[PDB]
């Protein structure tokens, strides 16, 4: 009678953006990103990918409430780099790593036959 729908976890409404970027003015060259309809799966992956770049100085995420399906991520970079650019770079790098992983798994499965 107060239970929300089990598909509001992942189905993005039309009035809710998938992604929203605001800058943190306290420290230089930092941005706050809210990811809607996502959870720890994307957040931790992105966080541990970004934490290993030389040009990324701060990166973190939190899920403020478990009953709401979003997370917010703080990411700072050095003077030349833009945190947004580091975010596309991390996404592309993880995509390539998964592609190589898929190719090798398929080859291994074929060899096992």
């Amino acid at each position: 009678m107060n239970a929300p729908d089990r598909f509001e976890l992942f189905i993005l409404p039309d009035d809710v953006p998938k992604l929203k970027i605001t800058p943190d003015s306290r420290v230089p060259n930092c941005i706050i990103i809210k990811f809607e309809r996502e959870d720890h799966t994307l957040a931790n992956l992105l966080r541990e990918e970004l934490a290993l770049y030389p040009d990324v100085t701060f990166v973190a995420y939190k899920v403020e409430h478990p009953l709401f399906a979003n997370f917010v991520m703080r990411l700072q970079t050095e003077e030349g780099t833009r945190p947004k650019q580091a975010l596309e770079r991390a996404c592309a790098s993880i995509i390539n790593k998964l592609k190589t992983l898929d190719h090798k798994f398929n080859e291994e499965w074929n060899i096992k036959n």
Partner: protein, 49 residues
Amino acid sequence: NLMGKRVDFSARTVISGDPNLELDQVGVPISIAKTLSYPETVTQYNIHR
């Protein structure tokens, strides 16, 4: 009936713990939030809302 009485505009339900609430916050169910009401005078600062 005079020193104590039953009153309108009240609610009751089981309590739960929430590590993510502030000290002076209480989490209110949606159904109760819709059953209870507050009368808000219309002014030239709250007419859109």
